[PDB]
Amino acid sequence: MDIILGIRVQDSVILASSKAVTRGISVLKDSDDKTRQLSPHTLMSFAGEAGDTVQFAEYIQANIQLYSIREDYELSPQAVSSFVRQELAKSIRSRRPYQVNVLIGGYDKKKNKPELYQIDYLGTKVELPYGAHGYSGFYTFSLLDHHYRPDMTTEEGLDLLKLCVQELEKRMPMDFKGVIVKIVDKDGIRQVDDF
Amino acid sequence: TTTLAFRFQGGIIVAVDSRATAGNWVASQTVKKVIEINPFLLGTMAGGAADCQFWETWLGSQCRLHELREKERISVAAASKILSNLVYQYKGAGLSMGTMICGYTRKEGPTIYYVDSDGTRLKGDIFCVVSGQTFAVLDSNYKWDLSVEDALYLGKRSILAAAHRDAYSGGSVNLYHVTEDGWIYHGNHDVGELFWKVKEEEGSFNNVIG
Amino acid sequence: GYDRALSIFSPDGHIFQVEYALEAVKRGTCAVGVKGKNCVVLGCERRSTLKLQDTRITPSKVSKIDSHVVLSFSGLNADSRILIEKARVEAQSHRLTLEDPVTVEYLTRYVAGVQQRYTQSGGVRPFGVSTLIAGFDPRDDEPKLYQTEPSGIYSSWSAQTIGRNSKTVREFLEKNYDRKEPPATVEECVKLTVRSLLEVVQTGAKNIEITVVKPDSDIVALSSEEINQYVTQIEQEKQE
Amino acid sequence: SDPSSINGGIVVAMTGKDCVAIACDLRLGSQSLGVSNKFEKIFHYGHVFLGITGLATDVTTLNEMFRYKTNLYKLKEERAIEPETFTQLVSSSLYERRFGPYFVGPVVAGINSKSGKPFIAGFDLIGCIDEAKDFIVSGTASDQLFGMCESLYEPNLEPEDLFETISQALLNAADRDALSGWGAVVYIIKKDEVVKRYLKMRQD
Amino acid sequence: NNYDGDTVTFSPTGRLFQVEYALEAIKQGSVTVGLRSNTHAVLVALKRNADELSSYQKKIIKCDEHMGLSLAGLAPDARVLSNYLRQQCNYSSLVFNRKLAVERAGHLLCDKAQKNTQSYGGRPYGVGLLIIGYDKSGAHLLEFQPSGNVTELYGTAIGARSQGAKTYLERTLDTFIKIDGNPDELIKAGVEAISQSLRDESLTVDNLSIAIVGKDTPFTIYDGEAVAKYI
Amino acid sequence: QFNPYGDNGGTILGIAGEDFAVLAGDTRNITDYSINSRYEPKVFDCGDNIVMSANGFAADGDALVKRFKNSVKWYHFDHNDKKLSINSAARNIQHLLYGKRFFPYYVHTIIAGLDEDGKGAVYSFDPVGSYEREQCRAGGAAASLIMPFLDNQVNFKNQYEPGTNGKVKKPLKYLSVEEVIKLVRDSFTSATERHIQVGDGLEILIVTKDGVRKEFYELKRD
Amino acid sequence: GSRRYDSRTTIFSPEGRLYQVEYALESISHAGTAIGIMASDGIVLAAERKVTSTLLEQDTSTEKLYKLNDKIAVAVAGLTADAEILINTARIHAQNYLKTYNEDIPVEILVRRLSDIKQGYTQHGGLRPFGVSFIYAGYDDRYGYQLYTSNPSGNYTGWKAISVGANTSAAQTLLQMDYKDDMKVDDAIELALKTLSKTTDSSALTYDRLEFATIRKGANDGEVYQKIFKPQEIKDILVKTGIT
Amino acid sequence: DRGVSTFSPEGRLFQVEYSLEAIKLGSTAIGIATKEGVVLGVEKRATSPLLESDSIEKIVEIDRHIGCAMSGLTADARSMIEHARTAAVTHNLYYDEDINVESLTQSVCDLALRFGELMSRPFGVALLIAGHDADDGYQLFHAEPSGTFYRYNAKAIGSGSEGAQAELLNEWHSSLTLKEAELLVLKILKQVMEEKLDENNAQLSCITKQDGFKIYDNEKTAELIKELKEKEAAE
Amino acid sequence: TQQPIVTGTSVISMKYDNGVIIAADNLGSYGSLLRFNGVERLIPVGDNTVVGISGDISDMQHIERLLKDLVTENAYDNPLADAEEALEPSYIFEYLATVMYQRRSKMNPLWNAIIVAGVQSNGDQFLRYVNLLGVTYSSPTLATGFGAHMANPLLRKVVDRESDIPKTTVQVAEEAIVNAMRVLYYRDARSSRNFSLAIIDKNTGLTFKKNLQVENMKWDFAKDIKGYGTQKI
């Protein structure tokens, strides 16, 4: 199964996403990036049913990029998360629902605060210091409950994230071929090459 | 069914078997599992034979319309996404398709996209489908700096490896070399004759007597 | 539904509703496009009959269609919004399906296609709008400037103007714009665009808007003071 | 599998002397896994309070829907909606999805601004109204809440006494339900003041 | 005058001017002749060129193996009505294993044309058709007017100067009806008939279009050096 | 529940010669263990020197052949009586079959004729319109009994040159129409002995530049 | 058929004008004057009710000033019934935006949507346009205090001060003369009433002929309050500013 | 007013006859069919010297074997070209072959009379459709907004048509070479054009069996213009 | 999709030298209950065609109305309705075959097996079968349901191939049919003694025989059968 983790530290939001794409017993890819830049200060990670995940993520990207051009303004992460939730809440009662789970990490330039939103395929949304989707939540959550401090620096958050991944690599039956880590802060979105 | 596509210095190698089975019955040993979409784009047949043929012939039609309207060769990214978007409309209806969309453009270089009936679209350096399993066969002798002659052999040898072990793979190997100026057919090789020659010349398949 | 054929042929082979749409464009404030060697500049007239205007919030005359393409227009402001909305949707739709932003020529061809459709569809009148569409194709440094009109015809221009007194500013551009050597720098191109509007505008105060589009999605609107410096330098050279 | 017990959580409402109380737990889960301890299930539109238990996506959707509808009501009526009228709107809204319902147990609490009469109501997922004088219970520990309320409740309790009763009814009911707890909120509602209290409780 | 603005308006004398104007488009059209015996039915059509560089507009359309027509007036309208006959012939074959009777084909063309004369927004068909066929009751010739009036005839002509050919056939009636089991002689009579409608121009090899259907003859069109025999 | 499909048995055989093609079928029509007819033709002249058979569910087979024959008639109308080439016919039949992808024609389709170079052509289709050009294809009940024999006696598979000990394959010779018809007749005689759905009669349509001609041979009626 | 009786409400004149838009604007010129003035610390909406009666119930009467949400109000000039159709549409769009994004609709987005509806009636459908001009007074946290106008054409523009309805030529000159950028709400209130008092076709300006509203951050701390003035409150501000 | 589909007392459709007047105001387009190929030439007629003339597209590819020149309200042609390309590709998909030039032309002409109270008016543009198929070789067709299409050995449309057609009447013979046809189109364009013909205000194209449809480079056309000038000065 | 409720059993038929014979019993069965006895399942169309129908009787009554409507429709604007443009057996069959296949293709069949017996204009015998699946076939003998299993074997002993048809007289053909109806009465638990028989002859036209009974039955041997093995009384 796929790992998508998010931790919101003092001044940023970090998203860790498993690189593995597996269909049945064969591993299709080991370098997959389960992320879409919605806006310059908003990143969305996604895990779920094949096809649905990328189709949903790209559709949200197109809609947020359209809104950006039309108003020459960046929607707040809260606004982007509410839009994404409503799209998912529509799809559950649709003919064929999107089986996609998302983490939305964004930096709010007005409030100068990082925000992390967890939304499941039903349109269940919560704002948390840290979150995860799937089996990974069970393993990781208890570790983050102990170590997490709200005034943590980006480097401390990466260390805590690094600890989580090592633990998951040991206890998980699946090989998820490592994670890609992206940081969302006031300066924007960047990928951590070293992990 | 065994279909192989990989990227190298000299472009893309595409290697497929030619066996079609209904249950234990061998319906054909002369199936063409490479679909010539147009002179620069190749598709591989896996899952439904009709689904792959029909929608990849349709893709060639859509690709031709794109070139008339925009007066430019369609990118592999764009060609692959037309097919992936179409099968996604039909998702849950029972389309069966696992295909590698292969092309070489100046913009992109050699590009392979794996396109799925489930709506999966993945860009990769190497894709193999063996009888209901797909992945990034032997993987031991593959390096980017490989000759066109050597790369053709590796694809041919890789299909031979699967054809021997897998009941639903066999007949012949069909070879294609994909370049920026288009694809080149590298012929039909009977697996029966290939096996004996490979065995003798390589020394391999010691377990088999001949 | 209302199906009435409003755009029809007259005995002399004219479509009056399309020609009367061009008259709406003639009444519109002047818009000018000038492409340099490594830039395109869009100049727009703001009629000074309206003061007490809030310039922060008032719809600007130049609209971004994507990060790399801009659209200015002459004619019915309300009509222009429908073409801008459709163009912005199509720009995102193209990125989503082709995995590449629209070429300037493609976006022009789409807008022009919409304008044409409204000249032989029942129960609709043509757009009272002509557009200047400028920008740079993805990963290309060659400047692009296109014009569309109500009929739906479009074409590429070294420089072009539309709207009221466009005849005068086209006269200016035709004698002042050299094809062999276009405005080499941003300065030269902006200067020539401001000069072309000063033939028609009246006061060089808040009546001239200038938007500079450079390669790789580099689009910036000049302020009042920045334009005022061009207006000052032009007339000081003229006093001779 | 059962939509009304995936996320878990409870709401209880009680009437007192010239006052009403409405209370909820703060847990949101994915079955056995607790996800959030800050998922409040009580909303207010003017002076009318709505608690919603059940599928969390529907709790959020119905809150957004009733905010929408009470905002338009106010603009047109030029006055805040009353508990009795809102109860009918909740019922109407739920029954229009008769054959594709929201998986929720809504609870209305509030005091009529004109009559001053304390009002509570509950609903099944398709909008059938329970207009009890005493108390309304909803959620995964509704049996436990019925038990607690039926013994603890007496009529015409003063606001500060009613607070203790509803608090002890919620806390002890939640502690006998796996999918409820992780904190609790109690609203004490009087004609022109509302006090909101977060309760200390076991976090397992 | 005031009553010719659309097909839905009767004149004070009970005329339909739009239908009469449609009828006028046929008169402007190039001449085409129809005539039959008891064994065969023949179409002869004078094709019209735009200029000396241009081709000669095709006049005869095959509807089935046993039926086809010649057109005079708006060619695109003939294409619509012929397509409709092809479909009705095809429906009869597929559903009932039955070749459509020429008389029933006439009834269908009448009813399709009529609907365009009683409804607002539409216009009458601007073409006349001569339908020939061989069915279970032998050889047939029909004349279609876009008024909806369809008439079974031994012979007729429509288009410019058609009156000349029509008078000739009216004289020859007793002769050409008896040309049984001789296709060449029946065509000769048709070519001699259409010759009465020529002025200045004469029948050349790319000018003349002939069709024939009969007892043991599928509907076949003759153009080019295939009609040189009859010039 | 109502089952919209049935099995009418029957076996068909298409072979492509150098300058000819044959499409053969048994004339027996069955349901379960009953014989419906001992002579119900299954191979049809469709015009333009094309012969067709859609073996399996006879209702779906009749419908497809009817639709294809109609497709030829309309191709003539729409394209100035242009002859429909066997390759164009094959692509057309794919679209007819794939049209009912989610409620298929329960048939195995074979067409035979000449290509545009005048060489023998056979095209084989799955129920949903997957198709391939082939030199040999048997379809229907006794296909598994016939194809191994044809592999051996047409392509000379597993046959080598005596005294070379399997170093030289038996060389492929161009088969005459007379030798192909012998192999067809022997294929159906063998199939009739070992398959209960095969028998009664054999109808062979032979396609050459001269046109389509018909040969009929009796099979055992048990 | 029916074509005979079609006025063709969506065609250009030979000069490239929209007949029905131009005639709708003529209609609006006879409507009671509405004035909007934007200050640094709030907005003023002032509007004249058209020749009223002594028996009209003023305290329950609304023909000029309407609430769209808690942050945005409109002043109406033209057919009141036509305005109410558009107002209800605007109220629904505001709530749709709030439901979707969980944020109050920015003023311009609401104004653009209503303007786009008006535009549609001028380009398709063969229906008459809405005989309505709106002054939009609103606040959002992007642009702060904003004044807009829209007219039957579906064109909209931003303003520091603007008038619609009767005697806009005279009203705009008077506003352009006395308006300054550093002006405050209390000053803007005085300007608006003084302008109506001079432009009015009535003998004198009284409380029973006016509708008045202010959007102020004069709401306790970091929030915005809409105040639709009561008949007695309009009478007080008329005495305060020294017009009665 | 009056119906869009109304017949005149002469038995002609008003709107069709009026659209033919719009086409007369169009820039000139000339086609010449030979046994070596079909040549298509157009007057570009730029409205200003600042208009980049290479952006004027009045010669268009429909398929590899079918080219198309237009005259009149050229914007109206875009949906006709779209339909023609779709028809050509759709037929190849269904039948694994090239579509006949006549069948493609017939498909375009089926749109023409689909107007009433379907589109609100006829097309205000005429098309010269040139192509090759195996059955009827090299072909040139004139597609009108009446829905009628004529085959032509040579045809001119637009403002200079009746003058150009009279010239084509004298010049065309069955033995013309492709090179002779090219010079002949350039000659007749130069005669009927207001401005002086050069490689920037006129455009050539051809369809051959071997190479298919090709729009000529300005450099290639410039050499044929220089060849024309010399051969006219040669007597 | 439905299930048949009131049902008719075997329709049997064969070609002879000059025409065709078709027969069917008069029963309408309601499961094991033999509810209706006066049900006519041979429906003549003009004087040249008889349509024999088995299976669902409600669907048969629908098809009966379609054929009655077909005769009315054919007579519209048809001066030769009683001559050259009269309904042929081949026309009536192709129509029913079209309807049957369309109805099965909408997954809502007419729950019937139909045999169309008649003589064409040129005097050719017509005999063809169609059922709820739209499956069609022709043979010198045709039968539905039990008839296929028991009638065909007996009728095929008279006409085993096409070349036997000219050698088969109407007396021999009728005898074979009447015997086959007796065998079906012995052995089909859904048959009745009472049946209708129709002869369509190219010379003597349509002869329709109602209220026919199975006769010359053998039962006497039953008296000698005692117990199921060992019993002697």
From Swiss-Prot, chain D:
Cross-link (Glycyl lysine isopeptide (Lys-Gly) (interchain with G-Cter in ubiquitin)): 69
Record bears the keyword Protease: no
Subunit structure comment from the entry: The 26S proteasome consists of a 20S proteasome core and two 19S regulatory subunits. The 20S proteasome core is composed of 28 subunits that are arranged in four stacked rings, resulting in a barrel-shaped structure. The two end rings are each formed by seven alpha subunits, and the two central rings are each formed by seven beta subunits. The catalytic chamber with the active sites is on the inside of the barrel.
Domain of life: Eukaryota
Membership in a protein family: Belongs to the peptidase T1B family.
Family annotation (Pfam families): Proteasome
One of the GO biological process terms: proteasomal ubiquitin-independent protein catabolic process
Residue list for modification Phosphoserine: 30
Protein name: Proteasome subunit beta type-3
Function as written in the Swiss-Prot or TrEMBL entry: Non-catalytic component of the proteasome which degrades poly-ubiquitinated proteins in the cytoplasm and in the nucleus. It is essential for the regulated turnover of proteins and for the removal of misfolded proteins. The proteasome is a multicatalytic proteinase complex that is characterized by its ability to cleave peptides with Arg, Phe, Tyr, Leu, and Glu adjacent to the leaving group at neutral or slightly basic pH. It has an ATP-dependent proteolytic activity. This subunit may participate in the trypsin-like activity of the enzyme complex.
The entry's keywords: Cytoplasm, Isopeptide bond, Nucleus, Phosphoprotein, Proteasome, Ubl conjugation
Name of the encoding gene: PUP3
Subcellular localization: Cytoplasm; Nucleus
From Swiss-Prot, chain F:
Compartments in which it is found: Cytoplasm; Nucleus
Main location: cytoplasm
GO cellular component, one term: proteasome core complex, beta-subunit complex
UniProt superkingdom: Eukaryota
One GO BP: proteasome-mediated ubiquitin-dependent protein catabolic process
InterPro entries found in the cross-reference section: Ntn_hydrolases_N, Proteasome_bsu_CS, Proteasome_sua/b, Proteasome_suB-type
Protein keywords: Cytoplasm, Nucleus, Proteasome
UniProt cross-references to SUPFAM superfamilies, sorted A to Z: N-terminal nucleophile aminohydrolases (Ntn hydrolases) (SSF56235)
Ranges in coiled-coil conformation: none
PROSITE patterns: PROTEASOME_BETA_1, PROTEASOME_BETA_2
UniProt keyword Hydrolase, yes or no: no
Record function comment: Non-catalytic component of the proteasome which degrades poly-ubiquitinated proteins in the cytoplasm and in the nucleus. It is essential for the regulated turnover of proteins and for the removal of misfolded proteins. The proteasome is a multicatalytic proteinase complex that is characterized by its ability to cleave peptides with Arg, Phe, Tyr, Leu, and Glu adjacent to the leaving group at neutral or slightly basic pH. It has an ATP-dependent proteolytic activity.
Family: Belongs to the peptidase T1B family.
Name of this chain's protein: Proteasome subunit beta type-6
Species name: Saccharomyces cerevisiae (strain ATCC 204508 / S288c) (Baker's yeast)
Gene that encodes it: PRE7
From Swiss-Prot, chain G:
Entry-linked CDD domains: proteasome_alpha_type_4
Sequence intervals crossing the membrane: none
InterPro entries in the record: Ntn_hydrolases_N, Proteasome_alpha, Proteasome_alpha-type, Proteasome_asu_N, Proteasome_bsu_CS, Proteasome_sua/b
Cross-link named Glycyl lysine isopeptide (Lys-Gly) (interchain with G-Cter in ubiquitin), sites: 99, 198, 230
Biological function: The proteasome degrades poly-ubiquitinated proteins in the cytoplasm and in the nucleus. It is essential for the regulated turnover of proteins and for the removal of misfolded proteins. The proteasome is a multicatalytic proteinase complex that is characterized by its ability to cleave peptides with Arg, Phe, Tyr, Leu, and Glu adjacent to the leaving group at neutral or slightly basic pH. It has an ATP-dependent proteolytic activity.
Family, similarity comment: Belongs to the peptidase T1A family.
Name of the molecule in the record: Proteasome subunit alpha type-3
Species of the source: Saccharomyces cerevisiae (strain ATCC 204508 / S288c) (Baker's yeast)
From Swiss-Prot, chain H:
Family annotation (NCBIfam families): PRK03996.1 (NF003075)
Miscellaneous notes: Present with 17100 molecules/cell in log phase SD medium.
CDD domains: proteasome_alpha_type_5
Residue(s) carrying Phosphothreonine: 47
Entry-linked InterPro entries: Ntn_hydrolases_N (IPR029055), Proteasome_alpha (IPR050115), Proteasome_alpha-type (IPR023332), Proteasome_alpha_type_5 (IPR033812), Proteasome_asu_N (IPR000426), Proteasome_sua/b (IPR001353)
Modified residues (Phosphoserine): 48
GO BP of this protein: proteasomal ubiquitin-independent protein catabolic process; proteasome-mediated ubiquitin-dependent protein catabolic process
Protein name in the entry: Proteasome subunit alpha type-5
Main location: cytoplasm
Keywords per UniProt: Cytoplasm, Nucleus, Phosphoprotein, Proteasome
GN (gene name): PUP2
Organism expressing this protein natively: Saccharomyces cerevisiae (strain ATCC 204508 / S288c)
Family statement: Belongs to the peptidase T1A family.
Compartments where found: Cytoplasm; Nucleus
Biological role: The proteasome degrades poly-ubiquitinated proteins in the cytoplasm and in the nucleus. It is essential for the regulated turnover of proteins and for the removal of misfolded proteins. The proteasome is a multicatalytic proteinase complex that is characterized by its ability to cleave peptides with Arg, Phe, Tyr, Leu, and Glu adjacent to the leaving group at neutral or slightly basic pH. It has an ATP-dependent proteolytic activity.
GO CC annotation: nucleus; proteasome complex; proteasome core complex, alpha-subunit complex; proteasome storage granule
